[PDB]
Short mmCIF file of C-alpha atoms and ligand atoms in Angstrom, two decimals:
data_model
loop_
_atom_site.label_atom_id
_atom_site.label_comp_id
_atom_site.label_asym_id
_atom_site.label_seq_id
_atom_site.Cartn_x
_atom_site.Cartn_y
_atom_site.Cartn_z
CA UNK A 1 -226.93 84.79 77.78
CA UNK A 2 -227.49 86.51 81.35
CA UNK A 3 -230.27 86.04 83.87
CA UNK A 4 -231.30 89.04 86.85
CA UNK A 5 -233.36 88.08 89.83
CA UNK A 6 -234.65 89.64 92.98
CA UNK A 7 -233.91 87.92 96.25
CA UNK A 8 -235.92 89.13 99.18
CA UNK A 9 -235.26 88.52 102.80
CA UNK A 10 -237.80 86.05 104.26
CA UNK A 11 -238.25 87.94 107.51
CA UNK A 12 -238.17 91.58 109.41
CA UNK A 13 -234.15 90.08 110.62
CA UNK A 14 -232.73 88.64 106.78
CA UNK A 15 -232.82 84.89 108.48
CA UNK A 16 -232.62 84.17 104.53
CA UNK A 17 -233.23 85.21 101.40
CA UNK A 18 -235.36 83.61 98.31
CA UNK A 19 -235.44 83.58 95.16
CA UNK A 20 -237.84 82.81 92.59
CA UNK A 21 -237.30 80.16 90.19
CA UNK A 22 -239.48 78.67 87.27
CA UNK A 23 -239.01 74.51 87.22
CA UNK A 24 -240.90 72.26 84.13
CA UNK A 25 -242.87 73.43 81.23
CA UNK A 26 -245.76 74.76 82.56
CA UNK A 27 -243.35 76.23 84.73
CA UNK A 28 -243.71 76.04 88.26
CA UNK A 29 -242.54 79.22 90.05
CA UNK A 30 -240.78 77.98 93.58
CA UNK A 31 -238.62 80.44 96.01
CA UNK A 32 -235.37 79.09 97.00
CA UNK A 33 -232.55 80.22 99.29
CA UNK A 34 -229.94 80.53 97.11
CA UNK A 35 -226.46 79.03 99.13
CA UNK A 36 -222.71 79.32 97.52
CA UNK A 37 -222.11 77.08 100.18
CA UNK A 38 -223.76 73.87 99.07
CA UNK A 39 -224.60 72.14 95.53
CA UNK A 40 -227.64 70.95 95.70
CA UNK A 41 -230.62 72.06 93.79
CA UNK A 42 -233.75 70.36 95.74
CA UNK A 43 -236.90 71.32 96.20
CA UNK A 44 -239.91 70.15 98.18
CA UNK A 45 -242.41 68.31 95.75
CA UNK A 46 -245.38 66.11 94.93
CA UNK A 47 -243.26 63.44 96.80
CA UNK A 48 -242.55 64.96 100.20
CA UNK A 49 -243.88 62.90 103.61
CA UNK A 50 -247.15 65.15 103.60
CA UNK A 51 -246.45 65.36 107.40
CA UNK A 52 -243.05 67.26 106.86
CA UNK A 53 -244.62 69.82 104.16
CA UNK A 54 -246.14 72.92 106.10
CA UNK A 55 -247.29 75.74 103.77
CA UNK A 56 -244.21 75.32 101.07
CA UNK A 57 -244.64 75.45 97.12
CA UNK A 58 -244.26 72.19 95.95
CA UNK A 59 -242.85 70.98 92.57
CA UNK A 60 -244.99 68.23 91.25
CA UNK A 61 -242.97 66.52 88.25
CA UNK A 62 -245.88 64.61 86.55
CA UNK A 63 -247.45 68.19 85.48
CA UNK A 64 -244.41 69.51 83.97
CA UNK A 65 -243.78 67.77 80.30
CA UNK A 66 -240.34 67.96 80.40
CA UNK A 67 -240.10 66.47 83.68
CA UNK A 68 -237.62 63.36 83.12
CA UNK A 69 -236.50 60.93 86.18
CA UNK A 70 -232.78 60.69 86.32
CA UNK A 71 -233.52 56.94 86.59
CA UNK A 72 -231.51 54.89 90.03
CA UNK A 73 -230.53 58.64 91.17
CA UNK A 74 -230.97 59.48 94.96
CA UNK A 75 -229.74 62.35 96.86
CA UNK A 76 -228.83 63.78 100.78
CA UNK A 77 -227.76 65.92 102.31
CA UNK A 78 -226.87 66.78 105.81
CA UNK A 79 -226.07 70.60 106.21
CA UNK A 80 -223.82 72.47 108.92
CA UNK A 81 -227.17 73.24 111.28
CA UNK A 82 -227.73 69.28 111.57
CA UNK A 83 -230.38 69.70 109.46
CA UNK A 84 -230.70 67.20 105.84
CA UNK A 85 -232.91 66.28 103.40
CA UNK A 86 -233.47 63.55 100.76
CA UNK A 87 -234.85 62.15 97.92
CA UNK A 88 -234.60 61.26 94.40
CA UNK A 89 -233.70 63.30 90.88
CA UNK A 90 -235.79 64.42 88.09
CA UNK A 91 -234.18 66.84 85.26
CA UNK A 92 -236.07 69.39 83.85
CA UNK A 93 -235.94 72.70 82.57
CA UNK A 94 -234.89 75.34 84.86
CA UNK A 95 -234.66 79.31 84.80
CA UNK A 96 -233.98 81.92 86.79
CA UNK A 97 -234.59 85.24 86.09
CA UNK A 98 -234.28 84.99 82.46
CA UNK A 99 -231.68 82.22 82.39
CA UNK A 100 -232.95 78.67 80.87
CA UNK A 101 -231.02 75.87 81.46
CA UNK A 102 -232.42 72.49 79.94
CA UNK A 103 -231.62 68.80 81.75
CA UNK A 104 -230.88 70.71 85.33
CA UNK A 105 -231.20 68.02 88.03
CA UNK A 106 -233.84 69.12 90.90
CA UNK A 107 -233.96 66.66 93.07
CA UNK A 108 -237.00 65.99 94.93
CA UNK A 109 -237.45 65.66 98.67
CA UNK A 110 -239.14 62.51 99.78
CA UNK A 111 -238.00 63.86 103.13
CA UNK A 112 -236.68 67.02 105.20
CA UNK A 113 -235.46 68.01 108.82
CA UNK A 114 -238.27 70.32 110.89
CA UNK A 115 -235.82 73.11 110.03
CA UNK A 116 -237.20 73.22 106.51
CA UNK A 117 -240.57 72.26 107.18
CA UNK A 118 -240.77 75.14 109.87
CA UNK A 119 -239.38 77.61 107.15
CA UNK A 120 -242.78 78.05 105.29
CA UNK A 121 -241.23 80.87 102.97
CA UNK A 122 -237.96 78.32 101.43
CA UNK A 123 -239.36 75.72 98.91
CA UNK A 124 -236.08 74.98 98.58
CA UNK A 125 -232.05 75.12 97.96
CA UNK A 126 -230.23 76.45 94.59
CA UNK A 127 -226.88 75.19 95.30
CA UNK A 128 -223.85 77.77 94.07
CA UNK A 129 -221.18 75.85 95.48
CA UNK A 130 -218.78 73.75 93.36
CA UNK A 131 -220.35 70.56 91.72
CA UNK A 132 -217.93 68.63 93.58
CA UNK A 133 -220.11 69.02 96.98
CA UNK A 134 -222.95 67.60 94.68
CA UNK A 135 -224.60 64.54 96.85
CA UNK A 136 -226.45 62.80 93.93
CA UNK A 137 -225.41 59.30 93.83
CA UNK A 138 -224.42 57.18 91.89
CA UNK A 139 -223.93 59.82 89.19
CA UNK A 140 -222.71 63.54 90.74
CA UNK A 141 -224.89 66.31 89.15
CA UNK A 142 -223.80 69.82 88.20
CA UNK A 143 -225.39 72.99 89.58
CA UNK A 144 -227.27 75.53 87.75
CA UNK A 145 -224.37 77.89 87.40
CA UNK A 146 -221.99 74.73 86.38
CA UNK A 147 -224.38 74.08 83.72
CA UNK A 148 -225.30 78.10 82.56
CA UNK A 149 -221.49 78.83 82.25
CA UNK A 150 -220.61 77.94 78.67
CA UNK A 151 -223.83 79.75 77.61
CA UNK A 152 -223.18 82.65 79.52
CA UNK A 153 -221.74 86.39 78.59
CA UNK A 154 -219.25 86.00 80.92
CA UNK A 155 -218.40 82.67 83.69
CA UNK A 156 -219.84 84.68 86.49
CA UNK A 157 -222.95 85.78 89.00
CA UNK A 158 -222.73 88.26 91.24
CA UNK A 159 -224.47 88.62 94.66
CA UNK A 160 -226.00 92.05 95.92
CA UNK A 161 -227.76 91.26 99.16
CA UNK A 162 -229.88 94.02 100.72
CA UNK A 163 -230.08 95.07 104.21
CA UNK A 164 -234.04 94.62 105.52
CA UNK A 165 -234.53 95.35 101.84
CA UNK A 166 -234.66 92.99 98.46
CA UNK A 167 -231.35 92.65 96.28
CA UNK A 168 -230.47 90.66 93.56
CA UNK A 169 -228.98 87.79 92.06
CA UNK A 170 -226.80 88.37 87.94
CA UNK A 171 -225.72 85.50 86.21
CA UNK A 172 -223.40 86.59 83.22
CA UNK A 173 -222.29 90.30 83.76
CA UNK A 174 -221.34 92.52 86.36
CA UNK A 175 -223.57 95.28 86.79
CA UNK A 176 -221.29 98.52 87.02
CA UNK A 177 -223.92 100.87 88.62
CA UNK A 178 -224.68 98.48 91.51
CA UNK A 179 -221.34 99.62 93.67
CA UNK A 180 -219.36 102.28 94.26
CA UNK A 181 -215.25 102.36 93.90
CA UNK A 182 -213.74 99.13 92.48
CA UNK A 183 -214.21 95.42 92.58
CA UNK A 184 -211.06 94.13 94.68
CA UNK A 185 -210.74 90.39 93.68
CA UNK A 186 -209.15 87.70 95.67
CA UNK A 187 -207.89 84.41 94.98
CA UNK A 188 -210.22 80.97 95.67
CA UNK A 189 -209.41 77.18 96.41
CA UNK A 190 -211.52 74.49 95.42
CA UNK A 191 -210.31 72.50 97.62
CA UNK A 192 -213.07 71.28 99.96
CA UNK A 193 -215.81 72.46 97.11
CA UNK A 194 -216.39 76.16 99.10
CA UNK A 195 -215.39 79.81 97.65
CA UNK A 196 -212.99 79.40 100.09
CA UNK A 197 -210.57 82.76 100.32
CA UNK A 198 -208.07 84.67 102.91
CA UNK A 199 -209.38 88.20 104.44
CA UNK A 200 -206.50 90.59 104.84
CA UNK A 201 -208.08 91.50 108.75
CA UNK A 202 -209.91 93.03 110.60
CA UNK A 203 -211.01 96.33 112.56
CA UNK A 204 -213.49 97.07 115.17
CA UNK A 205 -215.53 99.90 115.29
CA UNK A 206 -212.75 103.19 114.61
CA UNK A 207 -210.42 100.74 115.80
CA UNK A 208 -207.08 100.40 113.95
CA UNK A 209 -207.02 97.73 111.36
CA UNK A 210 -205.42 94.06 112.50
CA UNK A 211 -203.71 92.42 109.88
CA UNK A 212 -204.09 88.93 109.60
CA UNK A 213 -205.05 86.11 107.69
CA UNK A 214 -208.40 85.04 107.67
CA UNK A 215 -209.18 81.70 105.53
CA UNK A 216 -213.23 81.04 105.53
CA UNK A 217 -215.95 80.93 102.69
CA UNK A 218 -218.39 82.93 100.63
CA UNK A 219 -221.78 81.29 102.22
CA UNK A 220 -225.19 83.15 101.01
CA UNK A 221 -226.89 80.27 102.66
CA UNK A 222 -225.75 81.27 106.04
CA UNK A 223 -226.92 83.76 107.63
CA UNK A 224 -224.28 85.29 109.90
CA UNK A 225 -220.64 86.20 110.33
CA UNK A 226 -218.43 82.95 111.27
CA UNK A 227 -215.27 84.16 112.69
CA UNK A 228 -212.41 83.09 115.20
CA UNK A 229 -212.87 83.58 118.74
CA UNK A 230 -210.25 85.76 119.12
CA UNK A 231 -211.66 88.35 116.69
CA UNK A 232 -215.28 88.04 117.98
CA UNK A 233 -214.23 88.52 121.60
CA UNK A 234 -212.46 91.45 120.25
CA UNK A 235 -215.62 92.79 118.94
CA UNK A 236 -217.86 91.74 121.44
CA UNK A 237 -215.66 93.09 124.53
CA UNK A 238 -216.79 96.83 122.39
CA UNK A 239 -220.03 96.41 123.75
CA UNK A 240 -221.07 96.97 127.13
CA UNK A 241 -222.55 94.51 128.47
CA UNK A 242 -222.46 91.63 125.80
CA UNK A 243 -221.19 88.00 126.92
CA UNK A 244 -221.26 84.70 125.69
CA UNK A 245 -224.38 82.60 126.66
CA UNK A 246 -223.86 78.90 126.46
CA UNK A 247 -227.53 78.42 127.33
CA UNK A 248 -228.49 80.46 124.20
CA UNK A 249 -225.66 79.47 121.78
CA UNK A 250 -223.70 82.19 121.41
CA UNK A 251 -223.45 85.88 122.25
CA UNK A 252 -226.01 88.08 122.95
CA UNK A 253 -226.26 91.65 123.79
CA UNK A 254 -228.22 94.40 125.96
CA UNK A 255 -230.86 95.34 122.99
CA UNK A 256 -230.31 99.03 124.35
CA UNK A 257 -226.91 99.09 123.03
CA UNK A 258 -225.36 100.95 119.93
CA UNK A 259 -223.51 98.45 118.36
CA UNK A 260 -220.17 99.28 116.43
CA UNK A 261 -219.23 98.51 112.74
CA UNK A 262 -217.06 95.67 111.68
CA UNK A 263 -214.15 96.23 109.16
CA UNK A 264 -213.07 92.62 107.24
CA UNK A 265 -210.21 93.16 104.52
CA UNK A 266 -209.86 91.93 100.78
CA UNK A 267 -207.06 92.66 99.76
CA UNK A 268 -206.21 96.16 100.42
CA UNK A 269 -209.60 96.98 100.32
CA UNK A 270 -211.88 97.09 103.24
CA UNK A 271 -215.41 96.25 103.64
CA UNK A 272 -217.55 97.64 106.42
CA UNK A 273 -220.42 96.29 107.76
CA UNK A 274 -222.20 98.77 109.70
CA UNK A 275 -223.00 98.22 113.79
CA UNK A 276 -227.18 97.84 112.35
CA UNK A 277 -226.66 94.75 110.39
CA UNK A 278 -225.27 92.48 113.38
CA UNK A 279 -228.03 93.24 115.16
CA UNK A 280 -230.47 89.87 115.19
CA UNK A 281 -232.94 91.12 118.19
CA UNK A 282 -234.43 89.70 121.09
CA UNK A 283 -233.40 86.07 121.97
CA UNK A 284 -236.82 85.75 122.51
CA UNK A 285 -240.16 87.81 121.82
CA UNK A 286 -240.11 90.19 124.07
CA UNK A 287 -236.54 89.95 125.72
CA UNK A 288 -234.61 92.79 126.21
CA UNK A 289 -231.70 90.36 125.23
CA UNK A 290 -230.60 90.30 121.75
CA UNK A 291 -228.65 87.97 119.78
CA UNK A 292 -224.88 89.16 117.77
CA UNK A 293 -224.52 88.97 114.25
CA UNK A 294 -221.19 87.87 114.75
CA UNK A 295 -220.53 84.70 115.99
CA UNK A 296 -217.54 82.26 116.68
CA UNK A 297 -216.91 79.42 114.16
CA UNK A 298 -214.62 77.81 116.73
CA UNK A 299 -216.88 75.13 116.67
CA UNK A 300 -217.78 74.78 112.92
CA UNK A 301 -214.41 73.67 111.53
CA UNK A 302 -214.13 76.98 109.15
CA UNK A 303 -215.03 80.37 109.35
CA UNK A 304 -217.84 81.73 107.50
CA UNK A 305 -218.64 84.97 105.12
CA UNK A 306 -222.57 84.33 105.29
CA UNK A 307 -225.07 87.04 104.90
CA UNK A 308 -223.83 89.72 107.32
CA UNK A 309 -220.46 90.07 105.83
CA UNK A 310 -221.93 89.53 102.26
CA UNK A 311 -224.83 92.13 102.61
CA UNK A 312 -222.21 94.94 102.91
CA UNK A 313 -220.70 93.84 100.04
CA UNK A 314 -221.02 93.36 95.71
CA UNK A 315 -219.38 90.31 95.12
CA UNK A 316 -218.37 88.68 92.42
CA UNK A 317 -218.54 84.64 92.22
CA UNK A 318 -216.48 84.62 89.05
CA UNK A 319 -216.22 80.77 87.89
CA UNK A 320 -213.36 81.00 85.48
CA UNK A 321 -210.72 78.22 85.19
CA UNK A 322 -209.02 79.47 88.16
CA UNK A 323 -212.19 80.77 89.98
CA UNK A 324 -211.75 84.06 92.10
CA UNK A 325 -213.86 86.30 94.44
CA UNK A 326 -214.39 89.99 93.63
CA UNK A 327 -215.82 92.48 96.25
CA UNK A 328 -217.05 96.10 96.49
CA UNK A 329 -218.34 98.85 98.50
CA UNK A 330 -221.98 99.59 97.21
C1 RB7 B 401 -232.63 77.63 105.27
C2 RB7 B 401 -231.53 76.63 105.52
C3 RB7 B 401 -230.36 76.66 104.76
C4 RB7 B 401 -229.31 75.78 104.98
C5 RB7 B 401 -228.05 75.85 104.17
N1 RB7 B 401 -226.99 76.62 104.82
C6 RB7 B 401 -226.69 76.17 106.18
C7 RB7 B 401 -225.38 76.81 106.63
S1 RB7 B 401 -224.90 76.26 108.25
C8 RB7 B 401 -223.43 77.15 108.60
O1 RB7 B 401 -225.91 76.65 109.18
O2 RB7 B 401 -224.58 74.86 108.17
C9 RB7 B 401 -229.45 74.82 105.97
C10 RB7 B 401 -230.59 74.75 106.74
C11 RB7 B 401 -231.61 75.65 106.50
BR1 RB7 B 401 -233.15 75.53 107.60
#
């Protein structure tokens, strides 16, 4: 089997992206961020605090007949941003863009953070991390990919993330006219549950390439470029005018500035993300501040691929025995 889904930003700036996805029989169409960095399918539902539910599609288990609760089963999760959620586990049928799975788990928020309930456009998270990360307790849950892979084509999906423009999600095959050149592949650990891999370097701009070893993770559910201080204040210091602002959280730039690309390696292979897509706008409506797409993770614990890096990219999520990353120009 396959499955092929659009995934559309949820704003003018790619804050996120969602994804539609049919849950129960009737099905019941919800949009959720899709995030290879957590494993986790939840969605708000019949059972969210009404309070903390603000415009969101909800799932409502008792109209879907092959709703089933995953009796004694709770679930949360507290998420990078300090932001969590809650709740307890049905299993029903799930599908995504073609794909059926039967006896998913979607766990169902009793409560969320303001994060989430701000966020009219996410009903939810489709987690695409390793089932390992999973928080239902007492019985750990597998994702929707964990589950698809036997029936699958091939033990793989593929992200293709647009810039200010839909893209698309492929579960099973690897669409050969969606990039250009060849898919470099990389080696992953499991280890802490992430597609966790090591970039070959960096460049800056038409700046000579810096080889070194970069160890972060593959994160569609964040949506900027994580990276070590050293290599942000690299980039940064290319831009006239751009500092670090504790008061705002990071660095920000004159929003009358050309900003340049940013180079990250795979391999031998290089991926460019042009100077547009780190571009995040005014701190503030109106400001003539505006806010990097690049970031330091020095505070984080790990670096982080999310959607700035990724957009530039195809890549590969291919959940073999010994999983590995694949990317490509497109
Ligand atoms: C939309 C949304 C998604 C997620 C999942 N990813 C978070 C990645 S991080 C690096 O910020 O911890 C959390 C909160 C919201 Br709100």
């Amino acid at each position: 089997s396959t499955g092929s889904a659009t995934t559309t930003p949820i704003d003018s700036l790619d804050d996120a992206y969602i994804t539609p996805v049919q849950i129960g029989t009737p099905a019941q169409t919800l949009n959720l961020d899709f995030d290879t960095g957590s494993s986790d399918l939840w969605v708000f539902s019949s059972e969210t605090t009404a309070s903390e539910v603000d415009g969101q599609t909800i799932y409502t288990p008792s109209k879907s007949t092959t709703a089933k609760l995953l009796s004694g089963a709770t679930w949360s999760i507290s998420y990078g941003d300090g932001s969590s959620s809650s709740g307890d586990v049905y299993t029903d049928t799930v599908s995504v863009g073609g794909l059926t799975v039967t006896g998913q788990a979607v766990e169902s928020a009793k409560k969320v953070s303001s994060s989430f309930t701000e966020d009219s456009t996410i009903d939810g998270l489709l987690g695409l991390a390793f089932s390992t990360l999973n928080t239902v307790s007492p019985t750990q849950q597998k994702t929707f990919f964990d589950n698809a892979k036997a029936s699958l084509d091939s033990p793989v999906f593929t992200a293709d993330l647009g810039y200010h423009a839909p893209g698309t999600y492929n579960f099973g095959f690897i669409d050969t006219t969606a990039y250009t050149g060849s898919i470099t592949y990389t080696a992953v650990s499991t280890k802490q549950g992430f597609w966790e891999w090591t970039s070959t370097g960096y460049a800056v701009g038409s700046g000579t390439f810096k080889s070194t070893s970069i160890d972060g993770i593959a994160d569609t559910g964040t949506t900027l470029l994580y990276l070590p201080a050293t290599v942000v204040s690299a980039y940064w210091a290319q831009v006239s005018g751009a500092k670090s602002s504790s008061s705002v959280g990071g660095y920000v730039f004159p929003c009358s500035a050309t900003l340049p690309s940013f180079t990250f390696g795979v391999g031998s292979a290089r991926i460019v993300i042009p100077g547009d897509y780190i571009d995040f706008g005014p701190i503030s409506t109106g400001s003539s501040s505006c806010f990097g797409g690049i970031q330091s993770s020095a505070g984080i614990g790990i670096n982080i691929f999310g959607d700035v890096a990724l957009k530039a990219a195809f890549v590969v999520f291919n959940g073999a025995t010994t999983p590995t990353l694949g990317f490509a120009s497109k």
